[PDB]
Amino acid sequence: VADRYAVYWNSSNPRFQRGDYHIDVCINDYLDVFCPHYEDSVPEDKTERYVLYMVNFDGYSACDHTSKGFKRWECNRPHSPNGPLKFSEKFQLFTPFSLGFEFRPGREYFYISSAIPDNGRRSCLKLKVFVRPTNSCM
Amino acid sequence: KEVVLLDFAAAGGELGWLTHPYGKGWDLMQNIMNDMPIYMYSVCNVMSGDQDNWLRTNWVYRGEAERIFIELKFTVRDCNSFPGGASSCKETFNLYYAESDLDYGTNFQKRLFTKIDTIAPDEITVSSDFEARHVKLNVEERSVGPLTRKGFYLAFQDIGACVALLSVRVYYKKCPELLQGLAHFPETIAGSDAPSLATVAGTCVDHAVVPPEEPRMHCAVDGEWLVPIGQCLCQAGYEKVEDACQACSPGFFKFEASESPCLECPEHTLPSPEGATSCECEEGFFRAPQDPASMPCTRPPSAPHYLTAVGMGAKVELRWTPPQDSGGREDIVYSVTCEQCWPSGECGPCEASVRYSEPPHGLTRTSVTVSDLEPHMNYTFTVEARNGVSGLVTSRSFRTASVSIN
């Protein structure tokens, strides 16, 4: 966990259920984001499904994905075959895809979720990500 | 038709090919697109100057293929749309290849490769195709031959550029299994040289064959067939149908080896069964030794319709009309005979002492003139209408008359 930072995105998480979950990655480090995985012994209603979004500060703040912000990942598979549905991100300065996204060293970035079943439209989950600067990664 | 050795595209991003050097070079991203999930193998060390970033496809088993067809899809980003912009970057990378007889696993060897082309973009993603989120995608293509060894590798070189491998897709080429004119042709594999014409012996479908020219086909490098030489014909009793060869209906036939269908049974002829060579003849009708079995059923000719004998002067002119039933033919030959019933009474055939103006038997005319005669005689005469089938008959057919001169 020196290049690759992992996080499992399910309501039953003690860092998220707080509200200030936040992390420190470096330029060229990854961010694996594992959805809520469910054994076939889960009755559909108790299966968490979300829709990940990459937004800014405001977007991070008022849990609002309508104004501005990307839609980056999607946990519609609570029943994925080989372990949990993975959604990865690399914090590299520069990206050769219109698709992809770029990451500045010593800015911070923000991610937020809204359940696919839609459940209680007011609060929600959220990660903050600070980028250690050019030379504070060691 | 094409046969595929590889499609990183549709591998739902689970292939993961060896990178080099040890993960500091090429990298794999996921990403949304058209709402569906897609993965790419990208690099972007424009800055780090001295490069050499390889990315090496697994191990493709050769198979039958001898010239393989590589087809990469990819976006390349522009070098002026970089803000820092350290101008050691580019938009050209390198395609390679390795023949091996044994997956070297995750052993890797640069020198071991030879290079195909330096692929480059037909569309640079520039600082604007970003703001909009515009996807400047490249389809470029190449291939190489011919491939001798068990199995081969691709692999890519990056000298510092902002590339991003969307699709690798490898496939080769065979010419479709084919029915073309009563010969069957394999499905069979193209080949390496550029004017390489596959020569493929055809084989004749059920019921058909070669008259002398051979059935043959020509298979190109693009997996196409080309110079139809020859054919096969629906044989003795069968008629070509579609690309089949169906038998001759109820009451038809086909005698020889022909491009022609089934001629319906002629006349005087019994409603043949299924697929009859020559048509079956009716009781009371015939055919000759030099006859076609198309030339219907015939019978010997009825006797001249009309007989007379004009005793014109001293020489009797013979004059007779042609038969009322030809026997459906046009090949009748009149044969004529003679006698001497003298009154006296003793009857008895002529003497060659008499003279004519034409030979006795086989007459394509209806008249002659008998000079050299004996005044006073029930001079009996008889002409006969005979054709060609007039030998499958003892039962004669003739007509007769008599004359006496003075």
Ligand SMILES: *[C@@H]1O[C@H](CO)[C@@H](O[C@@H]2O[C@H](CO)[C@@H](O[C@@H]3O[C@H](CO)[C@@H](O)[C@H](O)[C@H]3NC(C)=O)[C@H](O)[C@H]2NC(C)=O)[C@H](O)[C@H]1NC(C)=O
């Ligand atoms: C919701 O969140 C829970 C807490 O965040 C998850 O609990 C985690 O499950 C992980 C995997 O199921 C565990 O990580 C594993 O650790 C073991 C031993 O260290 C390793 O063998 C595994 O490699 C590793 N992960 C993998 C990929 O197998 C965590 O230990 C555990 N974390 C905690 C603190 O509870 C739940 O799994 C998750 N539930 C749902 C519904 O998604």
Ligand SMILES: *[C@@H]1O[C@H](CO)[C@@H](O)[C@H](O)[C@H]1NC(C)=O
């Ligand atoms: C010969 O001529 C007679 C007439 O005298 C005719 O009736 C007869 O047909 C002829 N002979 C025979 C064979 O009857």
